[PDB]
Amino acid sequence: MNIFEMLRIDEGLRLKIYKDTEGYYTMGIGHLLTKSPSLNAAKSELDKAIGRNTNGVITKDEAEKLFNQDVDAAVRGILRNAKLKPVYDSLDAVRRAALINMVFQMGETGVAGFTNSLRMLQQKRWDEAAVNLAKSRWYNQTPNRAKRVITTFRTGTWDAYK
127 carries an active-site annotation: no
88 vs 108 by CB, closer to Cl ion:
108
20 carries an active-site annotation: yes
Query: Using CA atoms in the order 125, 129, 132, 136, what is the torsion angle rounded to 10 degrees?
Result: 170
Burial class (CB in 10 A: 0-12, 13-18, 19+), 67: buried
Residue 136 is assigned to a ligand binding site: no
User: Which residue is catalytic, options 20, 47, 64, 128?
Assistant: 20
CA separation for the pair 91, 151 (Å, rounded): 15
Residue 104 is assigned to a ligand binding site: yes
83 vs 107 by CB, closer to Cl ion:
107
Residue 32 is assigned to a ligand binding site: yes
Beta strands in the chain (DSSP E): 14-19, 25-28, 31-34
- For binding to Cl ion (CB under 5 A), which residues are involved? 49, 142, 144-145
User: Which residue is catalytic, options 5, 10, 11, 22?
Assistant: 11
What are the Cα distances from residue 152, in Å, to 7, 38, 39, 131, 148? 13, 37, 36, 13, 6
7 vs 49 by CB, closer to Cl ion:
49
Residue 153 is assigned to a ligand binding site: no
Catalytic residues: 11, 20
Binding residues: 32, 104, 117, 132
Binding residues for substrate: 32, 104, 117, 132
